[PDB]
Amino acid sequence: MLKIIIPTTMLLPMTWMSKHNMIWINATVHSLLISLISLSLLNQLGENSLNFSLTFFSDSLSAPLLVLTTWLLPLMLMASQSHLSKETTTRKKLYITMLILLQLFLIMTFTATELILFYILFEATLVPTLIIITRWGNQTERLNAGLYFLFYTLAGSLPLLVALVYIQNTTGSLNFLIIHYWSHPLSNSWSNIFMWLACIMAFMVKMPLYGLHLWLPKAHVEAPIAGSMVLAAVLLKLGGYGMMRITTILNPLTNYMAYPFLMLSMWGMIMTSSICLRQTDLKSLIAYSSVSHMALVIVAIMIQTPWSFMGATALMIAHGLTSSMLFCLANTNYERVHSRTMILARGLQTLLPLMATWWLMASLTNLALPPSINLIGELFIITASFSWSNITIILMGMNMMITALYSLYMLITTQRGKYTHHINNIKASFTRENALMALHILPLLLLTLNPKMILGPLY
Amino acid sequence: MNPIIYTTLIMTVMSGTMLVMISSHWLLIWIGFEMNLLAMIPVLMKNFNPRATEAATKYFLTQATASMMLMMAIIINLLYSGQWTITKMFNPVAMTMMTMALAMKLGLSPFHFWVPEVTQGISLQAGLLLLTWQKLAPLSVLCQISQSINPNLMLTMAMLSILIGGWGGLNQTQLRKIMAYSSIAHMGWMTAVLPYNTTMTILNLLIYITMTLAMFMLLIHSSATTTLSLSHTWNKMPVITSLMMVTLLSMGGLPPLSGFMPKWMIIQEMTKNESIIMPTLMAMTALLNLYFYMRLAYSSSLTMFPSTNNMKMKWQFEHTKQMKLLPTMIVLSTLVLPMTPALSSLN
Amino acid sequence: LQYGPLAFVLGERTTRKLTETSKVITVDGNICSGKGRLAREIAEKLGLRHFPEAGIHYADSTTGDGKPLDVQLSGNCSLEKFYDDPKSNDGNSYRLQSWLYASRLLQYADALEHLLSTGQGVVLERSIYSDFVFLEAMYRQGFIRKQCVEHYNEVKKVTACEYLPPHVVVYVDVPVPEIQSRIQKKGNPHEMKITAAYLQDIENAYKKTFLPEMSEKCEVLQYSAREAEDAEKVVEDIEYLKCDKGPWPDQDDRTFHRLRMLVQNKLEVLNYTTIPVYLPEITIGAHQSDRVFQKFTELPGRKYSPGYNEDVGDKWIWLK
Amino acid sequence: IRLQEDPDPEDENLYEKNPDSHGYDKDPIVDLWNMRVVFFFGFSIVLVLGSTFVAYLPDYRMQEWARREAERLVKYREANGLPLMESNCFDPNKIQLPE
């Protein structure tokens, strides 16, 4: 409720009024503190969602994402104070302002009790991210990338606006509790299909599925490190949160309309993971991997099965934390080599021994190696999908097969092998980079002991 | 022009619009329109450049034609009803006649062709007056006679307003032409809801007004009329270009910025009126405004365009303008969404 | 207060203060022609405000202390450097001329601002209407590229069109060999190496273009070296005109009020100088421009608006 | 030379100035303090006690209360001999099914 929101926004004057060089310090102090307070929120009751007021409420689904976002907030600050050190104090303060303002909107969105209130900051998250991608992005095509990311979601979000207000004028309030209790069987009238399409495509765009996913490679690659993680570790999950809330009034229309999306998703993951197998850009390879994992969630949510929902949240947290780590991996070696081509810097393990270990366990987590939460998420979805239909295991398992190859492909190409001779600027890895890496991987294994925390409301 | 003469000319222009909004007699409504026209031309001619003369001539021809056309709408309504009172009129042809007559003053349909060109010819301050104050009077009549309007006739005007107004904006360099095209696009948004509920036509009016000042007298502050000229302003005063970009997205309608409040409310009303296809197209065409909106933001502050060594002088000196009401204009035009339920005050 | 519209409404006119001693007399001539010397007696013998020749740091002189700021922070060009390699690849020659044109353009406004607010005439060296003669000469030997010319007069017509031409201009006629004698005595090693062509090229651009073209909007009287040192004779001549030609002797307080509006706005006077046409000599990239501007901002006094810099000692900021 | 610009600055090595550099910023003393902040309020405060907080969180989802109701329910159920758990949930006797 307010015990997390006000400290977040009150953090904004602190960065603006802090000393010239303490901005990274003081922001990092309390960003970690906010996560601690958010961690207290993670407690959930039996079946009734933890309700605070008309304006804010939390359930077993919002809380794991809430603690994930607040936990993330220190990490961008940790990962960004290397390419922004040679910048004027105002721009650094302006940069820090963007993240915490962004992080404020995520907290508001997940805790929102009204779909329209959910909707308002559902779009508001883009304004800081667009600034981050364009202004502080370090490339040329970031301009086109920002346009692609902005227009794609808007093209899907605006039909949702017309859809949501239609529910308001037809079924009164759109409060999540009232909409869930007063759910009615959606008819199969040819208008209801377009009712269904509008209520779904908005989350589809910012949950990249095959076809509607071309903004992700350009956004992820071109954005700076902090922009890449936030857009890949929490932002893609905004679509995921939207469905679990919004398919309450889309049944039994979801039973029949799911086929075109299911077919695009299940086939898409095989295609997208195949792209990973032959990617030239390390960041792009990680970006396309996010498409495959998210496409797996698409099948999970659209099936509408208790097991599918539980694995959906499990993969939701796991993929975000893992993708954030991998983007840190790609970021950590990038400025050393000042390029994104994978084969440019080979044999990094011989020069940097610990980064080999960090990149190793990053690969295993992305591998869905048991008992990492990624495996729990993927394995749960397999059983739910298999009960839905027996054939899907052929598609389902083949993704795990392809996922093994490309995940290790970056490991062998970069970490192992002969070091490239000409490069001589690779310095011993800064303890900040090492600490940031453990900041990511360690809570993942810590979560292995308590999957029930991130299973979701269906648990 | 003598400042006292300039003050009087503006004084009548606002009174003419004031006269329109306070007249219960159709003849007086015309009086306010014409004497507003009578004093609008010299303001456009203040700079006195051949472009301004072309701009003023184009503006007078279209506005004089609309006003003369407006008479038969009054005269025909007189003829069939003998009522000078400004209420629901009693003739479809008279209703149809004035709808084009008032539309040409606003410039939504192909009638809009004068709107961009006149703004280009004349100075920034004159364009600010034309695009903000000179839109209250024609809108005021439509608000009063909204109950008599043919829904099909006016909605078609609104669609082509935002369609062409949004569409031509992609191909504009001179910032004045972008503003006029954006103004045409915003013109349709309010007029689309006008037959349904006039309250948020007014709500769209004040909000769209607030940006248009915030845009223009920021541009006046920048003293720039070309995208390249605006681009150089990052070197002199990067802060202005920062506030430039905030309003640019607010004018686009991205939440939680202020400019989202009109569009959101407009969509809600027609959805109540069962019209759900109509809002969807306008929302889809709203991104068209956002594109060239984003292009200026890319050129202004988000990127950093090259500058000229002669810019070094501008660092040494300072601005002499007092930019009145500027500090509250942007703030009221960027973050007022939480105070949305205040729209009932307009009712 | 200033000439703001309230002042004009309440009664502040311009024709009241100006009198017979209100002219924009310019002392002009060849390189090292003693025009700066000749400007002084005209100033002292007429009670008439003097303006020294606008250099690279003239704009620096107007602002702040007036101490010449760093060339990197103000000018990106050195006249002595231009002497060493006039056709240098960095574009020092055109950067020098374009900056020089801006400084004298600012000087022209400062002259008009003082005259229009005091009624006292102004004498200045090498008015902006004669600045082109160097660029034409600098274009003769290819010291600048062809693309510099159209940029220069593009700034000219977008700026110098509004600024009306002076009352009477005086010219110090000096033959090329005479300059080729003087610059030896000056001794500064950078001013030994001007080619006779450059002294020639400024000379004919004067005779065939400068004096005759603008002779029809103000009287032109030539003086040679012997006539130059005769301060008593020349000053008598300047008093012996009725100033027929020129746009000065027909306007009323309306134009003067409008003129003082533009001139007082020190941003507006040269707003068009930073013209967005891009050429290698004058265009500076974003990284260099951003670093220099940050270097300019961190300087004292310039961090905030004038009267708002606590570092220099602007007390009561919380009240101002 | 296209534009008057600056060459691409060389990436400074934080180590060559101070070999004990921690990669957090340039100034040493705050760098050492940045170490203390990130590890303390990171690993120590958040990770350790936060893990104990979530590990020792009170009954979540009523996982054990549901159990405690189960055995008392089942022990009652087979004590009488009636079926262990009814196939029907909302007692049909009070249901007023149409026709």
Partner: peptide, 26 residues
Amino acid sequence: RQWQPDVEWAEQFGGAVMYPTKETAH
């Protein structure tokens, strides 16, 4: 350093129209 626009990008947005043609060429 991060990429910044140059005369190529500037002239892209400079001219009569960013989307020119034969008709707008003159």
